[model samples]
Target chain A: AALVIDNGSGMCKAGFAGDDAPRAVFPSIVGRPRHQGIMVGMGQKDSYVGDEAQSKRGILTLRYPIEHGIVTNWDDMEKIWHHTFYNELRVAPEEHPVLLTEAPMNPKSNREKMTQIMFETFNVPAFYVSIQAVLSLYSSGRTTGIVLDSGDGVTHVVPIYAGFSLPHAILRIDLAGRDLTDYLMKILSERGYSFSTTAEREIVRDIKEKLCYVALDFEQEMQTAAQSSSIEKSYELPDGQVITIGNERFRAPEALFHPSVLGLESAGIDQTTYNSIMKCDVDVRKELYGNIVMSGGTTMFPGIAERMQKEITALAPSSMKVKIIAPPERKYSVWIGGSILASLTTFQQMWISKQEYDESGPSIVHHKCF
Target chain B: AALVIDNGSGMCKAGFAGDDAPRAVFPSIVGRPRHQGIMVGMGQKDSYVGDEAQSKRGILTLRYPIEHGIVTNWDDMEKIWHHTFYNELRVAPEEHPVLLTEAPMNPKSNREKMTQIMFETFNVPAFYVSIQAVLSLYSSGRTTGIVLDSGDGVTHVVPIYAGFSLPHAILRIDLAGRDLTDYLMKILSERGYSFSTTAEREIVRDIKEKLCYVALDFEQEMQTAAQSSSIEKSYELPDGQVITIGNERFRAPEALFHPSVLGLESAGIDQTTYNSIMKCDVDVRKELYGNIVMSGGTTMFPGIAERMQKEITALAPSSMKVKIIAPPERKYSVWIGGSILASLTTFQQMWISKQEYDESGPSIVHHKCF
Candidate 1:
């Protein structure tokens, strides 16, 4: 009955029929000639996505709006977003109400601005918005669980109860998939593994995804790194060149568990999670550990669940149930949740009416939703 | 006869009888096993020199005593310096007095430590310490012209009068050959050029030396950069990969003339020279422009003198004469200047005596010289 639009910085997923998967999925990035007027789509269908975007980075002039998980430099990016949106929809704007997903505790100004843009540009009849973490919870079909959404921008953890995000019970870490990729590149460069080739961005990301693993024993790994033979690692580029990389090979990624390496005064994920749970008023925090769900592109890495378990156990007070749930198609949890929410008949009642928009305007919408 | 030791970070150039050229020029860097007694010299002759040390950077763990144009981490550096001095001089206790060059305005603590190390370790009879700029003037056989000692560490402009350096008349810019190399690497990487190979450092440096040139009309060159098809506008690496460097490539080096590009708020070289001249009571500022000598490896690039002359002229009074001098074999100017100075009989007076050491000690030496 309605269209659900999940517009991420890197990828956009949209669906009309809520029961099945998205009718269309495409890259959110837009590219054009530096001096010429030729516009090129990125990802599949003459558009580049993921590895493809990275591979052609040398030749393409890319505009990335999602920096550190937030819409940045919106002026230049608005045109790209609109182009991708229209190209993907392939339909008139007056057809249906649009359901959108946003981050929890979204800034009122930003939320209002987005709403205004949608109304003015797309000319949709109505719009509905929900938090991504809440949608992620719906995707998991869990009554009580912690949803960890790690995307290109930032990693956010939120606890949900009965299809509602606990606004006060959220942990946001200013690190994400992009940071991991950048850290990997820096580590490789320091070891004389130069990512100066046309395919360097893709190659570095590929290597990081394939080779990097969250180690359970950090000190032991450091010791292993001290011995040259044990830590010896090399990556072969497409050009038939092999570069040896070592020393801080694992140190950069290890920051996720122990941020002290980056000179951040705060405790890492392990202690932060433990402390966050203890500060919560509810006793369910202890029992709810078994329902910990990891839903994001970054969580697809091997050994992440096991490593988190080990790190949490060491930092936790005593024996506590901890489980990591990797939902089917971990990357699309929020999109699926948004799609399902848009279809719910009861959810339709929560939608703002056309008359309400004319009377209260953007301020009322920001006050109620943001 | 005294031995003047030019213990530079890149190379240790030393010889007796105030040699016009070094008897031996070995790399100042050393590579030692983590737990072994074996020490490897970084250059040729079973040791390293300027180019060799840089070439072997990937495999060798280097130690630079002169960091940012001054002695750094002296305690850890003493053993390496002593080893190099002993090997080069082939001398024992009570040897000839040594004349060592330190940076202009060299820190007192650094000077004291260097003197202590020379006396305690090598047990030399006595030594003379002179600023590199002063030695450069002495080497050039000119007491009035501005001595521009641009080297591996820093670029220094010191005005000399009757063999004595006018400290207040000195001007320094942090821009150096290192900055140029770094900028070149960054530009190449952005353009998808890979320099990660074992031979990359040397190859990149060679390309820079061979291809990079100062632009006479930087803005005009930048505007027509894409259209410039000259061979000088392109460079081929040793790996047979060619890159179109373009005219706008000079933007990086132009940072000296326009520090705002690098986020520095200062009158750049263009205005700095004019302002310094205006601040001085001497009428020589006008004549000084004519004697603008270019020294150091950085100046070896073709068109540097012409570019500097053009830039200075734009900033100077329209009627003022601007001349730029590119000394033959610019790389050897500092050493040659030291050689020319050593030829003078009065050079002995500049040597610090044992009596002076006993009478005034480290404090006096530090205050008087620096």
Candidate 2:
């Protein structure tokens, strides 16, 4: 059976092909105990990954393996993948053909490096690398569209036409869920509720995920926030400490629309989406605007899809129509797309076989996969 | 024999213990042919490394394995290390203990990852990791000093007291040799001599290294450049085309002292060095200023040492004295330090043995090493 792995900056999802959902969805981070102190029971291993690492944050020094939608720390990444294969999925890599998804415009060098690790180190029988945006588009049953994927570390506006990704037209924003979580931490700190500890920061992330919402009219909504007590809400922590939240809920998410708020010198998501479409062929621009597919966890925020549609519509030409499709399973769209592709009977011949890899080299990935 | 490797962003140096010079000094880059076209003779392998990659770059897509003094691409890094062991040094890993030097403030995660690769993958008998600045200080026969090391990708200011580095005081500037080379390319482009091609860019790098020099008084030098032809020098390209360089020669290297020239929002080397000292204990600040050691290729430019001393002295207290040490072999100081350390009889007991690693795992590197 084929295995599908969607490695994201924030999470790692893996499962057998054709599954409705991944068997494992865990934070893509590695952790080691801060000090080699005594432990009870079986004692801890030198390193931990996924939920295990997250739960042990108080004693562990955590390290994220991926950054900006790319694997920057391969050793930590290998630990996460290794845990998924043996502990989570309980399947050996050599016994399964793996289908991995990469971010749009990922460098060729990175792809080739990944290929080498997959073949030379893990010894997978066969492999295939596909663009995440293309996979998301495929999962939505579309051969062409524009994918706006906003995940933990980055947001990408990828344009696809006729089942092919327009690499030159792809746009990226360094702001994402993690940045919003950071902004929330800062504002909450300003309110005298400091979250300095790693564990406390994780709690802040949870707060942002559950309470934050994008404001349709950022400035107008802030006025309402100032005028009424309705915007203020109270939340109890895991330890039973109650904290009041106010304008921070919307203000945190507003950075996505105004990156300057976070000190980033870049365009907002709406302008980025429009710019991406404009860079495509003139005939496809209208179709791209009409088929803006939203994927990744950051898109799950309430009112995001509506806000994106409204802002992009304002930017589009008068004659052009704008639409955004935010599927219920958008967060897992890339994994599901890989699952769907890998399960197809016609796709059997597409995997890069180990024999082919042995004949050519890791660079063969560029020729066969891309 | 203990094998010492100093892996820099631009170059990889490898040698045995007690060696005066590295047995292998090569660019830390990997390259594959751009297109799988026809070839004569044995043709090219799937990839090339070091000088071979640099020479065949006209037909290859070059990839630097290390970025800003960190190994971001492990596959390319492994290839370089493999080449060093078999092709360059002609030795086996299992037979020797390895001493690797890392930049100051290197994450614990990265250290453990390198340790894992050494023991679990390469199966070395023993391994040890040390900071580059400490080793450079050792190479200079000093246990306490401020080491300013600037290479191809970044410049670091590290302060040490009693043979131990002050981690909090280590500062880094993102400007370095490669940026200067790029600045030269831009200025040369304005002179109607464009170097847009990969091979032509290499020629521009050679021009920068051969002709560029630091100016003691940047503004005065510019005035001299504008007044007479003495400041202008003409160099003939490999194809017999002559290009004249004027103020660009000094202006390019001036970015090290004035990073704002390159649009970087950071302090210059002089201010940075003083700041690094100020961050340390007040009692050690005087010693740090008096024994400033310089290392790496970027420090080799003519008049850089004198210019650094002159500027830093102006920032110091009235009664304080400033000294800058630029050894004749500063460019290879880190590797030399590693070579000297690995040769020590007492250092034999300091290496993390394979048995220790097998018992405690990768995280054992942090416990045993720094």
Candidate 3:
């Protein structure tokens, strides 16, 4: 089976193609001991990844291999892929073909470099890369649509027509899950609770993921939250402390709808999506409006699809219809698409085989992959 | 002599108090040899900074200690500061009282950490920190004004009243000189000229600084450029290559007025300043409108003041007056403020001396500064 990897900035998903879900889902972070003085056990690795790294805590220095949907630390990324193949997946790279997903508008240099590494360092038999947004569109089984992907570090509104991404019209917003979690942390601080430590931040992240949600009518929700505890909830901390979380839930996610709350002047998701579609060719604007897909962890929030559909319809032409496809598995949509693609019988011809790599080298990545 | 250090993200300005201008001005970057395999010469440092770092480009890994107005890498920062004191100024920190300027909304944690380093590591006799905008306002000899500071990595619209900065009212836009240069590079690439190397980017920076100017009427300017070569110019590269630079000149800086040109949805500087003033108390809005000050290198472009004045006036209340102070020395305004401040007899008492640091510890920075 071909190995599929959706190496997102926040999370890494790796599993064999044809599987419904990834066998391993972990943060795309690497951890090294704070001091290199520690002795390693026999046959043990110096670098730790994913759950093991998360467990190391104060003793380790956690580093992100990717940031804002792009690989930043190549050394750490190599370690991540290495660990994924040998430890996580328990398979050697030489045997199976590899498929990876990248952010929209990824630089040509980066694509070439990634291809170089996979073939030269990992020595994989075959390799292919696809845009994350394109993969997400594929997950919905559509060749033409608009993808609103709000991951941990960045949000992108990409217009895809017939399986091809509209590069010039892509819209990016530097607000997403990480920002929301930070906003949540800011709100919690005002309640006389401090959550500054990495462990405490993890707890806060859990609270946000479990309790926070998008507001369909933000103003009405705020008034209701103030008048009664209807929207208020309490989270029990791991240490057995009960903390009251009120307006913060809706207020945190409201940043996505109204970025002004975060003092950012960027258009909110609703207007951003509409603006993205308007940038496309006049002929495709209506189709884009009627085929919007919401992917990424941030889009998993309750009432998000309804709010986006309602707000986007108001901004679009009256004759245009707005439809948002927000599947339950959207958080893993990109990975799922990769899985499905790699599992197809016809995909064998699509891969850049090791023999082909020897002929055209890394530059072939641009020619082979869209 | 008391030392005044305006450690900006883009440039470092350092000089003794009572000087008309900074004695030492350099790019705020550090460099380490790519391969540490080379042996260090006797009594020679392994790290280089400023001009020396700029010169050793291809063989070295250039790193930024500060990015977007924040000190992200403390180790590299300490190296930069050490080089600044010993190598650049040839002054010992212990002998002189120091005043540093920081960006607005700087975390209290950073302030405390900075104080700790200055007091314990540098062993400075006295130290003080002030907000960059406040210092820029001080350069203009005003206590109440609106400061529009656009440096290399970020732009900020700050509101001040009676020498006190209103944190909540400040607006930040992540467009600045570096971005304009990148946009220039992008345009240059389309012309079949690649400036990807660090040394080439430096040449591009020189071109941007010497040629680019904000357009008062961007639409009219574009039309004029299209019709004639009156607005175009040519630059001779070091390698004896001459390149014609036309609309790219005005088009690069145009992003400041209309960020939509850069695909960002953020409001332009004019609306941002207006938005900032509106966020302030109603009583101070008129004063802010009347006492607007423009500082930092990015603001030095011609026509910026006239354009900002025109646009902001249209956005302001009809009764309010708009005055913009765009001095020739605005690029060095922050350092000038610190220089003027440290020279005053009354200001001597403001520094947190060694005695105070010993008593209250690092947290005293917050007490003594802002």
Cα lDDT, all candidates: 0.64, 0.86, 0.85
Docking class of 2: incorrect
In the range A1-370, model 1's lDDT, one tens digit per residue, is 6877776645667777375577677655544333332555633344444334555565554556666556776654465445545666666656678777676645676566666666666666777777777777777777787777777666677876544455676877766666677567645543435343224655776677656776667788777876656666776767788766554556656867765444345566656566656655566776557777776677766666788777767766576877778756878888888877887888877775555666777665665553
Please report the TM-score between candidate 1 and the true structure: 0.56
Model 2 C-alpha lDDT per residue in residues B328-361, reported as the tens digit of each score = 9999999999998999898889999989998999
- TM-score between candidate 3 and the true structure: 0.53
User: Chain A TM-score of each model, in the order shown?
Assistant: 0.83, 0.96, 0.92
Per-residue error (Å), model 2, residue B249: 49
Which structure is stronger by DockQ: 2 or 3? 3
Per-residue lDDT over B127-215 for candidate 3, one digit per residue giving the tens place of the 0 to 100 score: 99987888888788899999999988789988999877798999898888887876787677535465654566677889999999988
* Candidate 3 residue lDDT tens string, A184-292: 8888888898987665666787898999998888899989988998877889987689999888988899999888667555679999898889878787888899899
Better structure of 2 and 3 per lDDT: 2
Give the CAPRI class of candidate 1. Answer: incorrect
Worst ten in a row by lDDT for model 2 chain B: B103-112
For residue B154, give model 2's deviation from the true position in Å.
29
Using DockQ, give the best candidate's number.
Answer: 1
Tell me the TM-score that candidate 1 gets on chain A alone.
0.83
Regions of candidate 3 where Cα sits further than 4 Å from its true position? A1-370, B35-45
TM-score each candidate: 0.56, 0.52, 0.53
